[PDB]
Structures are given as structure tokens and as C-alpha cells.
Amino acid sequence: ARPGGDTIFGKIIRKEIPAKIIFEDDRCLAFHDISPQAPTHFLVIPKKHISQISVAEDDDESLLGHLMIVGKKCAADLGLNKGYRMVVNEGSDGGQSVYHVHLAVLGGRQMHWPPG
Amino acid sequence: RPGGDTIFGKIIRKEIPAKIIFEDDRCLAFHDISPQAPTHFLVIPKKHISQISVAEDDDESLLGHLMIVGKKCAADLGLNKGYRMVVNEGSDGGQSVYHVHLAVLGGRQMHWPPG
Question: Which residue numbers delimit the HIT domain (chain B)?
């Protein structure tokens, strides 16, 4: 059900559909998750279509870190003071919902262990 | 001191043993002794970053390196059906050790939400 190799996240990057965008720069986009599982729950995605962390290249390393820096900066500016959890899901067992790499950040409540 | 003053610093300095999966000049991956999945390991930076919240912008390629090392270790441990990578920040995130780590869990179906 993805005849272009593309995803909903590609449409969001291209501004073809609305999203609750928190932050954007040249290489990533942060936005609120449309199905939140915590009072604060957002995504940081690369604009580069990396389908899953398992196929990320070594040269994508600083881009992946950039997602995490952007993530912690957005967390601070969404009022998360007491902490949060960053998550990357890979594949079926990881519960990956979209085949475009995404760092989820969840907070505003106590996150529990195990993490799923 | 190289590696900081946490349990993770002792592991980095080889003062206490761990089942190490991978090591280089920047990081160290090893199995969690309280696994929450058939496969459960940690990737830690050798640089003592106490919390992702106080990482510097400079730390970006090091943080990405943790994630690349994570996915490479996952592949080498046979996690072909998938896995979850987690970074815990602060009290609400369930951070216990004030040295940042990326946890990787697999070998079972992970559930949503992630805690």
C-alpha cells in the first residue's frame, strides 16, 4: 500500500498534509505524534528517506545524532523538566509503524519499565 | 577520570566485568544484566555525558555513533525481526544511572506504548 516507496512522513515533509510542526531545519522535522501515548509525544524525522535504522549508513551518523539533539531541544521547549524517553523502533518486533526513520520522544508522565 | 564516576565509568575502565559486544575509542556496547527481552544490551559513550538533556551540540556525531553501533550490534546478535532502541532521561524517563546510554531490546514482540 506504498506504490511510490514513499510514506505519510514524506507527505508531511513536503507539506502536502498538515501536521503539528514543532521545529524544522534543513535536515530534519519535529512534529507532534497524531496518536499520542503521553501528555507530550512527538517525532523527530530526517528529511532524508532512511526507511529504518537497520539500513542507515555510517555517513548518516551525525544526522542521526542531530535527531537526538533536536529532540532534547524540543523537549526543553515543550516544558519537559522531569524527564522523557526517546525511542527508535526497528521492524516488526520493534513495533515500527512507518518505514521512515523516526525518533519518538515521550514525556509528561512517568514512563514505565520495561519500555514495551 | 576517564569514563566518569558512575557504574558505567567502572565498566569503561574495565574495573568491573561486562559481556562486551563491541568497543572502539568512542563507545562500548554490552549486555544488560537485568534483560527485559531475550536480547537486551546498552551502548554507552566513553565520554561522560550525564544526561541527553545536557549534551552539547558538538556531541551530535558521538550520539549518532551510539545508534550506528547499536544497529550493527543488533544485526550481529541476530535480531533480524526487529528491535527497540531507548534513551531514558531523568525521573519520568526512568533514568537510574547518570551516564547516557542507548538500550537495545529485541527477540520478542515489543508493545506500544514504550512504557
Answer: 7-115
User: Which residue shows C-alpha cell 523516526?
Assistant: A102
| CATH number of the domain residue A41 falls in | 3.30.428.10
* C-alpha to C-alpha distances, B59 to A60, A68, A93, B20, B29, nearest whole angstrom: 15, 10, 30, 23, 18
Q: How many domains does chain A have?
A: 1
The reply to whether B115 falls in a domain is: no
Residue A69 lies in a domain: yes
Across the interface, do B114 and A109 touch by the CB < 8 Å criterion?
A: no
Domain that residue A61 falls in: 8-107
**How far is it, in rounded angstroms, from Cα A74 to Cα A68?**
10
Cβ B68–A61 below 8 Å, yes or no?
Answer: yes
User: Cell for B12?
Assistant: 569503561
From chain B residues 66-105, the ones with a CB under 8 A of any chain A CB are 67-68, 70-71, 74-75, 79, 81-95, 103, 105
B13 to chain A nearest CA, in Å?
25
CA-CA distances (angstroms) from residue A66 to A40, A74, A83, B12, B58? 20, 12, 19, 25, 10
Residue with cell string 535527531: A67
Experimental method: X-ray
